[PDB]
Amino acid sequence: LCPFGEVFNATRFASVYAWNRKRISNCVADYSVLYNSASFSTFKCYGVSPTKLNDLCFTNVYADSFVIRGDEVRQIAPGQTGKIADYNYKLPDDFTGCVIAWNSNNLDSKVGGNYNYLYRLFRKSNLKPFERDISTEIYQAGSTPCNGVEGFNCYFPLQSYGFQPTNGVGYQPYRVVVLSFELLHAPATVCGP
């Protein structure tokens, strides 16, 4: 009953810098449908087991979704660093929830390159957990002011992946869903079977 299909089977995904978040409530979730479903190359839960999830009830589940390089999936984890964790999507050190990813080369690559998926390459400080930065201000990497115009040491902060289907698997696009589980005073509406 929980519309996980809306998230996992969306036609297109957000760029990692502008990651999407769906709030899930008032429904029944069969997480076993997700885990014992093939072709997830990553399904790692922290603080909970996938099969214990069917026994728990939560007030709210949050599903964050975005696309990254295959090489970057390991950054969607507590305690990791790199351009994605630092500038785009940061999981806290003490994350409770699940990280699910799968190869999306067929959906998100094309010959000549799919340039619609972006990531933040430059930022003055690290994001911290669950912060979302969608600004596109010119990044001033040197000491000369940029006047909002790209130039030497004056960078557009977002760079394209340019996914091509003949890329190596580490340079192929992966779709990622991050589940966060909230238990508040309000009665729990997201339960397993």
């Epitope: 036609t11 297109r12 080369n105 067929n106 959906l107 094309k110 799919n114 619609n116």
Partner: single-chain antibody
Framework: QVQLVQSGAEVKKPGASVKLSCKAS????????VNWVRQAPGQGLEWIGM????????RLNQKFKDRVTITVDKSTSTAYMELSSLRSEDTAVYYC????????????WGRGTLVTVSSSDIVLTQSPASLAVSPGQRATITCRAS??????????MHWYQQKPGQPPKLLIY???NLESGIPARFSGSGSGTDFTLTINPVEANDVANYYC?????????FGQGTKVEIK
Amino acid sequence: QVQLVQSGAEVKKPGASVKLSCKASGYSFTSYWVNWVRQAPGQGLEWIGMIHPSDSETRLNQKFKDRVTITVDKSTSTAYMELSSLRSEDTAVYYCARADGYEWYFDVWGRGTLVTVSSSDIVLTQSPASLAVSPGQRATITCRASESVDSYGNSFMHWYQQKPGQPPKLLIYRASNLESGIPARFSGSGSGTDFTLTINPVEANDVANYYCQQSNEDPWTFGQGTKVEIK
């Protein structure tokens, strides 16, 4: 040349099976989706499904889930589509068509296979049904969609042209982009749910049918078509 060579026409009894084939050449078979799109008399263009030959990943129109199986043979660069329990409303032209991931407009079209059987989704609405224009005038066709076909800074609305005994031909992709090889008198605009195709100035060779098609959400859907004549 880049082409999709389709199997010949078949005549089937009701309840029988039909397995079409679509052989590709000139490009990297495993780098593109192969779609099946039928032109049914009275119903029009409907997308059946698609398969990516790199790993045979499929995506079916739920209207067809229980009757169609799609398959590929990479060594022969051939896509197959088998539609079962054939009914008289299955009689149609069956095109195979190429599409990029993330885009899913159709830039290369097979000839088509006529199959004859003896004895929710985004709905696209074009107007006018027929338009008469003299050469040198600016012709305008309209396409309206059930919901928005915009997504992530793009409008996934595309325009095609069809002439007799000839598959559709891509003219515009993502609302306003002239497909390479198409003359500059073809023009596209719009956003959200309302889109316009413009031919200016019309030529005697622009007499054809024109269809819009959205690829914002599953399944892909076509409009019912607009005819442009000359007067």
